[PDB]
Amino acid sequence: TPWSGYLDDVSAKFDTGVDNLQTQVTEALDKLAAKPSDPALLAAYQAKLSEYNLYRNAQSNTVKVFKDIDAAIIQNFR
Amino acid sequence: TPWSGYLDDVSAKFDTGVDNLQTQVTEALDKLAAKPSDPALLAAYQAKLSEYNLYRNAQSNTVKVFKDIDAAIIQNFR
Amino acid sequence: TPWSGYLDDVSAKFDTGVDNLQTQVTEALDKLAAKPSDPALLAAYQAKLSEYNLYRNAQSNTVKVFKDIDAAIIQNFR
Amino acid sequence: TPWSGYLDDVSAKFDTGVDNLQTQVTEALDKLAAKPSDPALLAAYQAKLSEYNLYRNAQSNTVKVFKDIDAAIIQNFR
Amino acid sequence: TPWSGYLDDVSAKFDTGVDNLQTQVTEALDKLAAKPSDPALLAAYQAKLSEYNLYRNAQSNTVKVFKDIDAAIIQNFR
Amino acid sequence: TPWSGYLDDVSAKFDTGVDNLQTQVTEALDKLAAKPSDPALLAAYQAKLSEYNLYRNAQSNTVKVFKDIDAAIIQNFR
Amino acid sequence: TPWSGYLDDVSAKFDTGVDNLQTQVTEALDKLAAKPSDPALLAAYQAKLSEYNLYRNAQSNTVKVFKDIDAAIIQNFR
Amino acid sequence: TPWSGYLDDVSAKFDTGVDNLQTQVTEALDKLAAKPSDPALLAAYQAKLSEYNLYRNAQSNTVKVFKDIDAAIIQNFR
Amino acid sequence: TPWSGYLDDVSAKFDTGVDNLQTQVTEALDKLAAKPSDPALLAAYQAKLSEYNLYRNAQSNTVKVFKDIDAAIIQNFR
Amino acid sequence: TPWSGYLDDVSAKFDTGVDNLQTQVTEALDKLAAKPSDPALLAAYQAKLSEYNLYRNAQSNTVKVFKDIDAAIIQNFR
Amino acid sequence: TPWSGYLDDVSAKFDTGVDNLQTQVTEALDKLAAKPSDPALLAAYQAKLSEYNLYRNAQSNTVKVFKDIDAAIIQNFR
Amino acid sequence: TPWSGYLDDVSAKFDTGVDNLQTQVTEALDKLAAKPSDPALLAAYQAKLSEYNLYRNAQSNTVKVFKDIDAAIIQNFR
Amino acid sequence: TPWSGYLDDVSAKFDTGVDNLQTQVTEALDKLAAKPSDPALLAAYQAKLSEYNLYRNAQSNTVKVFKDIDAAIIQNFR
Amino acid sequence: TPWSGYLDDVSAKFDTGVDNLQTQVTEALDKLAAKPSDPALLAAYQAKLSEYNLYRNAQSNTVKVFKDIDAAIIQNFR
Amino acid sequence: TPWSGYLDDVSAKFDTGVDNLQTQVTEALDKLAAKPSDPALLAAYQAKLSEYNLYRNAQSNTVKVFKDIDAAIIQNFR
Amino acid sequence: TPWSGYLDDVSAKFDTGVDNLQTQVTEALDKLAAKPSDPALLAAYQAKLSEYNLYRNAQSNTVKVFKDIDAAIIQNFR
Amino acid sequence: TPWSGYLDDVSAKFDTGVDNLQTQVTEALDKLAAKPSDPALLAAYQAKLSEYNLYRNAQSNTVKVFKDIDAAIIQNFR
Amino acid sequence: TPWSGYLDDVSAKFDTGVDNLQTQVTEALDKLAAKPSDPALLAAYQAKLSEYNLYRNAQSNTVKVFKDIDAAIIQNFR
Amino acid sequence: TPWSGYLDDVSAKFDTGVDNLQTQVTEALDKLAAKPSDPALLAAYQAKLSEYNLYRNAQSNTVKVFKDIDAAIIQNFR
Amino acid sequence: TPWSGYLDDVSAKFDTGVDNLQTQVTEALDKLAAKPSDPALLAAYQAKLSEYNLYRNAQSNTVKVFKDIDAAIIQNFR
């Protein structure tokens, strides 16, 4: 078992929160790439890609906030 | 059960809202393709196709608005 | 019961508005086809066919206007 | 009493501005659907439908302008 | 097997919908060209040519609508 | 009773300020999803969605300003 | 009193402009229908019907022009 | 007399600068709402609404600049 | 004296530029409505209506350009 | 009467300097929370909130400077 | 002096171009109406009426062309 | 083997997704250029060109979204 | 010498390109207005007017393209 | 002589660069307002207005760039 | 004569350096507030406001540097 | 030498194509007018007049086609 | 060798696709201009002119599509 | 030899990439200005102008991207 | 062998990580500069340039983080 | 010879590094100010201004870094 700190556990709450969003984006892109003119495949990929943008931005700002909460405690040791 | 977030649920309100509009367009196109000169088949396909344009544009703008409401909250975490 | 949106309901106001105009055209054509020289059958078919031209053009422009009223609202979501 | 904000009140100035334009369109369409060949019913429906296009486009652009006036104030809080 | 996307499949529903309309126009034109004064050959070619006008215009507008449904989804990715 | 600080109370002034805007958006979307072609349902949903964008952006910037007013006082303790 | 907008008032300038042209056409048709061989009744009905064609075409183009003048102002709000 | 600081006085230079622009927009909207098809009422409301967009954006950027001039002086006290 | 900004003054250059074009259209329509078959009244109304279309479109685009010149200056304050 | 030292008196010069700025922010937020789409309520709240940011930052830096002037005198007793 | 724009001046080049063609048609019709069997009065009225058809059609197409030249410049302001 | 990152692999999913769409456009253009009047060659080229527009726009927006997902992570390193 | 920028110089390439097309249209209209029934004067005016439509549309689109080339450079300064 | 800094001198290079473009726009608008149907006055005003859009946008972006070059030097004093 | 130390003299080099920049901002704001849509008044106020931002930031950083040069000499007395 | 564009050169191919058809019609009409009963003068004038009808209709349709070929290129600049 | 980009090469596929269609139109017009009454010269020129209309419209729309495919890639660089 | 940095060298790759596109646009405009009705001169100028739009937009976005790559390195010096 | 510290080795992990991305950008720009209208050359350059933006921003933030990790250790020596 | 320390010599490496970039910006602005609509003058000024932004920001950060390297040595004398 590799080491995983608190910022890893915050990042793994988002990773285990979504079930297979990293898989559903890649599958719906590969279904879209075979036929990039189907409205049932473009509107399904729009919902996957727009969630994957919002999943990944919220996951990359929650880590940055907890990095800044810790950087004002560690700076107050000395 | 695959994962479905909030933008999927907004997209699935439109998908479960219409009963079989993705089926009625394909059926009325296949009825039209056998005889593309019947006014009862052209005027019926006009109503299906024009709804399928308005169904899909409203479904692809409501996702884009909720993607922009979330992108101004996630940007205000830090 | 199949799904029928608003453009279907506008199209079905014209379809249920006329009682059997899709039937009276086909019957008066089949009466005309047996004897295409009777003035009582040509002048009766002229009134059916000219109404069926005006019925179907008004039914295919009212759908196109309501498709354009909706396409300026849906475009103003974002 | 349900909640109605400022964009609802701008939209309700148009809705209470016209008296029964949502009713006069539906009535003049149902009078037209029984007899879609009367020039007194086609020219009366043309005036109702063309106003209902201009009523609804001006009502759907005034909301979009006030949404853009507010989105440049709210963006200037921070 | 060559690649065929969704707009090709919509275009091939019209092409496989009619059986040999691209052949019946060319055959009835070549029968007409040998004797361009037969009313049984002019009235048969009128029905083929007028269907081939309506077949090809409906096939070239259904592609253009589905190109415009997709161009409002693809524009809403970003 | 759960704990609610000052930023929660600023966020709950917006939440208790609107009566049922989180409900009126979901209801007017579910009314729109059954028939996404009615201009009385698209223009009503435009006013709800555009208010819900302006409600939520002003609620997510007022919290961020009060977080920045406090972060310049807390930084001036030491 | 029912609501009447500007396109109704343009249409009612033509309707109140002619006194009883909608009545004189119907009366001169009912006088013609009893005896459709009188030159004093055919030449009088020709003048009524040809005016009623020019009355109704000018009334249905002046509305369409004012609908297009307004549709280039309303489109320039946003 | 309530308190009004410098950013209020900059905001009140715009408010007392225009005489009754907050009134002329509401009056020209209520005149437009009774008859949303008059070109003399649409082109007059276009000039009021487009000024009210430019009035309010310049008033909401001049406050934000003076908030940023002060935030670089106050930050240079310590 | 009511307030009139720069976009009002651009709109009032067109309004004071034409002397009584808003009056000459209404007078030539009321002269046309009494007798909608005179070629001296149809060709005179064609010249008034076609100028009133070009007057009002140029007046509603010059305001929109000056609204866009100002919206790129006001956006460059901050 | 509770005790109030010099840093309290510097803080109370800002508190008694503004009359009711702690009240005008809370009132203009509660007026904004009932209708968060009015430009007269967003631009008025922007001026209150931006002053309340500059009031409170200048009040929390003037105390910190006088704490540092005193901490270099008290350190020079011994 | 009433206002006369460019389309009026194009229309007045035709009106001042012919000297009294609007008078010569009415005079030669009133001379014809007293005796509608004279070949010197029918052949003179044929030349007046056929010129008045060609005068008025060229005058009503030159205005429509200059309305379309201007409508492609005014549309290219924005 | 040249280097290909993740945005290249997203771009190569579209390139390897379509089999020879870059070839079928060039071949159907060169077949069209020899005889630009065949409806079987214009309607076949319409389906290739409209897919090649939708293929290339979706391929040039999916790269731009993944460039923006990465630019909000890389910006949150520091 | 008045100032003339680059869009003036593009517009003056068309103005100095044609020698006296603004004069030949006005002269051939004034020759046509004296006798609007000569086929040598109608067919000569058709060639002048149709060139003056194509001269002025190409001159009003080349300015609009160069305005759009510059508006994507000026927008890329900041 | 009033004070004029460097951003004024950059703004006065554009103001003294064009000779009387602020005058030529107002003169060509006042010539257009007297007769808004002349193609020689619409195409001349299009070239003035499109230059005045490009003059003013380049003048309002060059100031904003030099404001940002200075704001990264002044921020690097301390 | 009131007392003015060295940091006052550095601050008064900026105050006497600009002639009436504190007056030209207030005058160009009061000219802008009467008509907040003139491009000659918005682009003139942009140059005044952007200089007044750069004047005041450089004046509030030069004082802070000389306060830090002195605070490392005074700290080196003891 | 006056200016002559491409539509003039197409019109001058017809004018220089026929040698003196504008002269032979006028001469054969003046020979016919002295004696309008000679079969050698009526049958010669029939051949001149019927050619002058076909000359002038083909000359006035070839200009209109080339005006429409150019109007679909000029419209595709922007 | 002059420079020729991709839109030139698309335009030169049409130019080198037809062998001498720009020559066959000019030759068949000059053969028609000498004798504009031959049915073997009118029906041959109809086939050349109608192909030259379809050649040039397809050549001027394929360039405009590839200009729009590129304008959505170049816009997605930044 | 004048100085040319890296953004000049990126801009000079586009300038030396095209051979004489700045010359071919000006030559094909001056050939078009002498005769703005030739389809061989309009379709040749369309290909030059549409390339010159795509040349200049790609040249003005590649500079802006490399300005933004450098502005995130220079900002990371301190 | 020149000296290369730890921040050089972190920078050389990115430089040796990509194989020839500094070469593939320059080659795909020089292929694009010869023909800046090919969609196969614009979409290939978009993927190279967008990776080169993300390569260089991640390489210029990882150095800045390791410079800040070291600057909090070196500051804790004394 | 005036005195120039090490930070002057670092600043003079940038000043003598570029040959006449302070001159080429002022010359290309004065060439742009005479004609602010030439794409060859806007795209040339974009490359000068964007380099002058990157020249001056790198010159104003390299001085600030060397000021901070020295301020941690001078602080370690005592």
Numbering used by the authors:
A (entry chain P), B (entry chain J), C (entry chain D), D (entry chain I), E (entry chain A), F (entry chain O), ...: 3 to 80
Give the published text.
Salmonella enterica serovar Typhimurium (S. Typhimurium), a gram-negative bacterium responsible for innumerable cases of acute gastroenteritis worldwide, utilizes two T3SSs, encoded within its pathogenicity islands 1 (SPI-1) and 2 (SPI-2), to invade cells and establish an intracellular replicative niche. The core component of this machine is the envelope-associated needle complex, which consists of a multiring base, an inner rod, and a needle filament extension that protrudes several nanometers from the bacterial surface. The entire structure is traversed by an approximately 2-nm channel that serves as a conduit for the T3SS protein substrates as they pass through the bacterial envelope. Furthermore, four residues at the end of the C-terminal α-helix, three charged (K66, D70, and R80) and one polar uncharged (Q77), form the lumen of the channel and create an electrostatic surface potential of alternating charges, which spiral upwardly about the needle, a feature that has been proposed to be important for substrate translocation.
Since we observed no differences between the structures of in vivo and in vitro polymerized needle filaments, we solved the cryo-EM structures of PrgIS49A and PrgIV67A filaments assembled in vitro from purified mutant proteins. These mutants are located within the C-terminal α-helix and resulted in specific phenotypes, such as constitutive secretion (PrgIS49A) or deficiency in the secretion of SipB (PrgIV67A). We found that S. Typhimurium strains expressing the PrgI mutants D10A, D11A, V20A, S49A, E53A, N55A, R58A, N63A, and N78A retained the ability to display SipD at the tip of the needle filament. Although limited by the resolution, the differences in helical symmetry in the two mutants analyzed resulted in small but measurable local differences in the distance between the mutated residues and neighboring residues from adjacent PrgI subunits in the assembled filaments. However, no significant difference among PrgIWT, PrgIS49A, and PrgIV67A was detected in the structures of the monomers extracted from the assembled filaments, with a Cα RMSD over 77 residues of 0.152 Å between PrgIWT and PrgIS49A and 0.225 Å between PrgIWT and PrgIV67A. However, the predicted electrostatic potential of the lumens of filaments assembled with the PrgIS49A and PrgIV67A mutants showed significant differences with wild type. Taken together, these results indicate that the PrgI mutations resulted in defined structural changes altering the surface properties of the lumen, which may be responsible for the phenotypes observed in bacteria expressing these mutant filament proteins. Indeed, the two mutants analyzed by this approach showed subtle but distinct changes on the electrostatic properties of the lumen surface even though the mutated residues do not directly participate in configuring the lumen surface.
